[PDB]
């Protein structure tokens, strides 16, 4: 599901879909883009931290 | 043999197999990579489009302290060393499809095998 790291040339990584502001989400999971939305799915519902 | 030939990675995937140190699977592995947990990333070689290989060695070699790798061949045997067990008259006896990206989280253990691989990729 998450192949989305735009890892540039050998071997720097630009992490796409910037990550959740949660201590449970220790910079690992990402935030979905629905509408007005960047969204934490890990905690199944709780956060709309949106840009 | 004498002692072993690249079987020292098998033992570490076994220690992270039984005692839950495998972020097994590329996505969960990258969650262990986008966490400070990963001091072992073991990848495979023959994959398609090579972009997830680029992902794995990108996050496994990016400038952050955090540069773990050694290297290991084909996916399904790498998953066999890693965590999914169904042994059943143990002559490899399985319908297992590959794992191909498993990442050891802290390995919860020590000497000659695990101390050997840490000595092995730390100092040449």
A39: which 2 tokens? Answer: 């969204």
Q: Measured on CA atoms in the order A19, A23, A28, A33, is the torsion positive or negative?
A: negative
| Whether the Cβ atoms of residue B65 and residue B38 lie closer than 8 Å to each other | no
Closest residue in chain A to residue B29, using alpha carbons only: A28
B80: which 2 tokens? Answer: 């066999």
Rg of chain B over all Cα atoms, to the nearest angstrom:
14
Mutate to test the interface with A, among B58, B69, B100, B103 (most CBs of A within 10 A): B58
B51 interfacial to chain A (CB closer than 8 Å): yes
For residue B84, what are the domain limits?
1-124
Q: CA of B60: how far to CAs of B4, B5, B32, in Å?
A: 26, 23, 11
Q: How many independent structural domains does chain B possess?
A: 1
Resolution as reported, in Å: 3.8
Interchain contact, A11 vs B34, CB within 8 Å: no
| Whether the Cβ atoms of residue B74 and residue B44 lie closer than 8 Å to each other | yes
B50 interfacial to chain A (CB closer than 8 Å): no
Within chain A, strands assigned E span 6-7, 13-14, 31-32, 39-40
B32 interfacial to chain A (CB closer than 8 Å): yes
Rg of chain A over all Cα atoms, to the nearest angstrom:
12
CATH of the domain at B67: 3.30.1330.30
β-pair partners for B41: B103
What are the chain A neighbours of B30 within 8 Å (beta carbons)?
Answer: 2, 5, 28
Q: How close does chain B come to A14, measured CA to CA in Å?
A: 10
Q: How close does chain A come to B58, measured CA to CA in Å?
A: 4
Experimental method: cryo-EM
Angle at CA of residue B50, ends B48 and B56, nearest 5°: 120
What are the chain A neighbours of B54 within 8 Å (beta carbons)?
Answer: 7, 10-11
């Amino acid at each position: 599901v998450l192949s989305y790291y735009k890892v540039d040339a050998e071997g720097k990584v630009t992490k796409l879909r910037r990550e959740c502001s949660n201590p449970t989400c220790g910079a690992g999971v990402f935030l979905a883009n629905h509408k007005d939305r960047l969204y934490c799915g890990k905690c199944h519902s709780v956060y709309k931290v949106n840009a | 043999a004498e002692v072993t030939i690249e079987d020292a990675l098998k033992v570490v995937l076994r220690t992270a197999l039984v005692h839950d140190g495998l972020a097994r699977g590329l996505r969960e592995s990258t969650k262990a990579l986008t966490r400070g947990e990963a001091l072992l990333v073991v990848l495979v070689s023959s994959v398609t489009e090579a972009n997830i290989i680029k992902l794995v060695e990108g996050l496994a070699n990016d400038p952050e302290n955090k540069v773990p790798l050694i290297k290991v061949a084909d996916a399904k045997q790498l998953g066999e060393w890693a965590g999914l067990g169904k042994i059943d008259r143990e002559g490899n006896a399985r319908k297992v499809v590959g794992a191909s990206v498993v990442v050891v989280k802290n390995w919860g253990a020590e000497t000659d095998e695990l101390s050997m691989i840490m000595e092995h990729f730390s100092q040449q």
